[PDB]
Design a protein around this ligand. Structure first.
Ligand SMILES: [Ca+2]
Ligand SMILES: [Ca+2]
Ligand SMILES: [Cl-]
Ligand SMILES: [Cl-]
Ligand SMILES: [Cl-]
Ligand SMILES: [Cl-]
Ligand SMILES: [Cl-]
Ligand SMILES: [Cl-]
Lengths: 471, 473
């Protein structure tokens, strides 16, 4: 049974890395990408922390697991993923894997340990369950100070970007690396197969890095994209509301937005260092050659595209797209340009590890694509499905279907749907939902979405068929 | 022999405005009904939101049982209609031979009264298709952006808050609803079947829109603002700060704007007092009044700047939670009831009057014993009311409140901050005492009372409550 290592990162965009022709030199990630299978059109399930992680680790959509919002935050109803959901963690433990977990969990206090893992170190490790939702009174005060024209140390805005004191060695990231090194050292001492997860809070906003990462990218040299610095025209109302207090970006200057990029880029450089330290330890311990590796970001993050920061209830590519590398040491490297989903991770682990089934797989194993390339799916529709059921206690019910040339977003809590022509408008600036020139494409996408909601037994199909009755 | 029933239902009508409650508006027709009937002077709504309160009124069950726990048809609620599995008192009355008629605001799903057997004579929902998209307030958003830039609408008004309508009373939706109600009463007098009429007015809801003379009847310059007007909210839950509906941004409101919101609302109350008189005079002219069993109720109150809030939202303040309620049984002597009653008590009261068949649980109680005996019917019983605020237009909050005459405890499970108000010493609910160790005995009492109530109604939030309140259980 093969050794598996997952390197999971929070709110890491698909596009930043040098292997994607992005602005940050990421030699260690690029080397893993070129040794493994690049999923260059990977899509998350939801641009939100807990839902994306539950889908990743269970292999089922939120309507089946119940984990359809963030946990532990104003004003979500949810505290934890049900312990009835053992996830790949309990399934691997059941067949004799030593499972270990380091870092960000965000699926309920103690959750990895309750499912049989060694939860070595992380925020959720010694927390009591059923805590009250964290309510951002301080961030509300801070953003009011920003709107009043105040700034933090050195003119920074610490709800967006911050220079941390000290060095890399003092960071949470370095501690997560060091716990991952200990995990690898301990695994090399056992004959038992191991399944390790190292889950980093970096590079999530607010973008907080020590020197030299804080200053390595000059804000003045940042290239800003075509959808930066735009007013949202004819977009759904949920994109305008201040769900979390830092979504008020009315105080942000162009310099503030540029520093949000430059500090994020420093965080990506720091993550590449962290990946190299773990890969070099895996090599030194003699585990690397047979190590089956997943590197993934749970979703992306908005850096001022459509005038949005962080995440919220919407489907733009900067949030919906995720970086994904799956390295199987038995296979030659390939680049997969067909779309894949976060729902495909658990079936891939299940095939690698011969995990027992614990119910439905709403995705598919990526091994055929890893072995054969895009030709594995020749003749099949190239779609992805995205949901945004909730944002921190706000219900939206959002569903998107994305093809290589178009995206349709159903907003059942609104009157306004979205239709983007990704071939002619890849920056998703122009909502074409009301344009009669796109009636054929809209009709196709509505039918594709109905098929997908039926496939996954989404109970919102009934409302979909009412809203879409003109098709 | 089955009694004729008339319900006069008003949207967002506060408990306190009427002259019979020593309020600032002369309301002689409502006062006369209060003086002839049973005054429920401490009536409480179930939820300060339109569709949940109306579903609880017409079904007699809480929203976790009926499913109707949010507004329907509004950004960004998941709901479109009260399930047709819920016949309500409308289908139950039709099934025993009442001719049921409905006029005006429904807000429980397109065609709903008609689908349940009523003559839906006239109203917004009568000819609407079902399963419509949620109304999303793009224009209100644009309007409030202009207000925040310092703009005003015509004649200095702010039409998301108050507006002088063109024309006369006779041109209004209210007058049309009265004319349909008069036709309903005229037709009822020609039938040998008992009748059940509901006339449900959008007035006096905000934005406060009235024609002359009601628009200028009450001088804004004379308005008395209360002690909790315009204050900075100290140590209150975060949901009271967020701009759920676009007009909740009141940062642009001057004191004069708030006084005009009051004076226009007072005009709307005067206008509905006229409407009530017109319908009561028609019932008298048609020979129906002497035996007519009448309920006058507001679905909830409305905020006029108390705690710096406008309209409604996810919170439990008395100006929203309290509702006006008069129940006139012509066989009984008039009394004033000072013990708390609930919107959940309306359906059981109708059930006793009308001998309605059981269609499931009654989460409230019939008010006939109080109507007959006065407050002493319940001597020895805890005087409590239970309030819920599960959702506000697609925002989940799970709020529960328990109110006694002297205290209120509010559980906000989507927050870390609960509320505790000493209504005896702080009736304006300015000071949140949740963290004050001097109120530990009262907090413990109210947490126990809430635990009893959630258990009684089989609320599935008891699992979470038991965790949040574990220090008290
Ligand atoms: Ca995330
Ligand atoms: Ca109402
Ligand atoms: Cl860090
Ligand atoms: Cl845009
Ligand atoms: Cl295969
Ligand atoms: Cl009117
Ligand atoms: Cl206050
Ligand atoms: Cl009785």
């Amino acid at each position: 049974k093969p050794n598996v290592l997952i390197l999971l990162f929070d709110d890491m965009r698909f596009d930043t890395f040098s292997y994607r022709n992005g602005p940050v030199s990421t030699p260690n990630i690029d080397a893993l990408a070129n040794e493994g299978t690049r999923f260059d059109q990977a899509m998350t399930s939801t641009g939100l922390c807990s839902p994306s992680r539950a889908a990743m680790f269970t292999g089922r959509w939120g309507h089946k697991t119940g984990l359809d919002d963030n946990v532990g935050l104003y004003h979500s109803r949810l505290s934890e993923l049900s312990l009835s959901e053992g996830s790949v963690i309990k399934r691997a433990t059941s067949i004799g894997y030593d499972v270990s977990y380091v870092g960000k969990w965000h699926l309920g206090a103690q959750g990895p340990a309750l499912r049989g893992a060694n939860f070595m170190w992380g925020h959720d490790k010694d927390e009591e369950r059923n805590g009250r939702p964290f309510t951002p009174y301080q961030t509300q005060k801070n953003v009011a100070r920003m709107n009043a024209g105040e700034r933090d140390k050195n003119g920074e805005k610490h709800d967006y970007y911050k220079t941390l004191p000290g060095t890399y060695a003092d960071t949470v990231t370095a501690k997560e690396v060091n716990e991952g090194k200990l995990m690898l050292q301990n695994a090399a001492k056992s004959d038992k197969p191991f399944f390790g997860i190292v889950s980093f809070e970096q590079p999530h906003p607010p973008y907080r890095v020590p020197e030299p990462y804080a200053s390595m990218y000059d804000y003045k040299d940042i290239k800003l994209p075509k959808n930066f610095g735009i007013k949202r025209k004819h977009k759904p109302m949920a994109q305008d509301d201040i769900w979390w207090p830092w979504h008020d970006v009315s105080h942000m200057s162009e310099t503030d937005w540029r520093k949000a990029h430059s500090f994020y880029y420093g965080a990506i450089a720091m993550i590449d260092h962290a990946v190299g330290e773990l890969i070099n330890t895996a090599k030194e311990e003699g585990l690397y050659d047979d190590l089956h590796i997943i590197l993934v970001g749970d979703q992306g993050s908005m850096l001022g595209e459509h005038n949005l920061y962080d995440k919220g209830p919407y489907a733009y590519d900067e949030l919906m797209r995720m970086p994904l590398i799956i390295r199987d040491p038995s296979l030659e490297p390939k680049i997969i340009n067909r779309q894949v989903s976060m729902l495909d991770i658990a079936p891939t682990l299940r095939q690698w590890m011969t995990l027992p089934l614990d119910g439905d797989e709403d995705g598919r194993s990526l091994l055929p694509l890893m072995k054969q390339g895009d030709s594995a799916d020749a003749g099949k529709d190239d779609i992805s499905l995205y949901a945004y059921e909730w944002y921190n206690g706000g219900w939206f019910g959002i569903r998107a279907i994305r093809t290589p040339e178009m995206k349709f977003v159903w907003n059942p809590g609104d009157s306004r749907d979205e239709l983007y022509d990704l071939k002619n408008d890849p920056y998703e600036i122009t909502n074409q939902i009301d344009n009669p020139k796109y009636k054929k494409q809209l009709t196709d996408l509505v039918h594709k979405m109905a098929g997908e909601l039926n496939r996954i037994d989404d109970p919102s199909l009934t409302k979909f068929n009412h809203h879409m009755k003109a098709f």
